[PDB]
């Protein structure tokens, strides 16, 4: 995020980091329950990648994080790689997350819920802060 | 290098019709745009949440997807529109 600010630690408890086997953060995701993470299909997650829950500072070794293995990747069958449309994947965890003060789920909308243009929302992540 | 500490930003939703002024026919019905407000999602944010408060609870409205290649803060970012996708989520959870 360019021109954002640091979050309060633990205040976005559904936010996960997707890391490869070398420990490199490559995408975010969100917990929707103890067993499932939603992310973008174009992130290209495989069962060799790791879900890191409960993280705040990726440079600190002191945080009580959960490193969760991925059992199966469910890429939406309507995902179109050419247009990047329907850009959603579900990850079924091998190891359930343990919910706590710093690890818990985001709500899903109903299919008929409305979010109007001009509404102020929030986004979070460990993406670049400058290009 | 990605930052060590988790970042946040508040930003407005746009309509797809207005987002098309920036991105033309690249905007599909399963996309929602947000930003162009002095902040931007950027590389490494992909897959993470765009949440809006609804009846007191944070609700997943978008999944960070794509946008400007330089993360321009005057151009809207594009997110997967979760309301268009939530049937599939529910069906997948129920079957697995």
């Amino acid at each position: 995020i360019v021109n954002g600010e640091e979050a309060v630690p633990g205040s976005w408890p559904w936010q996960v980091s997707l890391q490869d086997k070398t420990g490199f953060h490559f995408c975010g995701g969100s917990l929707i329950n103890e067993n499932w993470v939603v992310t973008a299909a174009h992130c290209g997650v495989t069962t060799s990648d790791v879900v890191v829950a409960g993280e705040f500072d990726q440079g600190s070794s002191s945080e009580k994080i959960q490193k969760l293995k991925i059992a199966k990747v469910f890429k939406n069958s309507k995902y179109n790689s050419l247009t990047i449309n329907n850009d959603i994947t579900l990850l079924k965890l091998s190891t359930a997350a343990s919910f706590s003060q710093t690890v818990s789920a985001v709500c899903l909308p109903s299919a008929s819920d409305d979010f109007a243009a001009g509404t102020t929302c929030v986004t979070t992540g460990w993406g670049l802060t400058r290009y | 290098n990605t930052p060590d500490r988790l970042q946040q930003a508040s930003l407005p939703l746009l309509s797809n019709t207005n987002c098309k002024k920036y991105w033309g026919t690249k905007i599909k019905d399963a996309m929602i745009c947000a930003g162009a407000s002095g902040v931007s999602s950027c590389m490494g944010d992909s897959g993470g949440p765009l949440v809006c408060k609804k009846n007191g609870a944070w609700t997943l409205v978008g999944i960070v997807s794509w946008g400007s290649s330089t993360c321009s803060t005057s151009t809207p970012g594009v997110y997967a529109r979760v309301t268009a996708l939530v049937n599939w989520v529910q069906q997948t959870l129920a079957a697995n």
Partner: peptide, 4 residues
């Protein structure tokens, strides 16, 4: 454009 670029994936994010």
């Amino acid at each position: 454009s670029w994936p994010w």
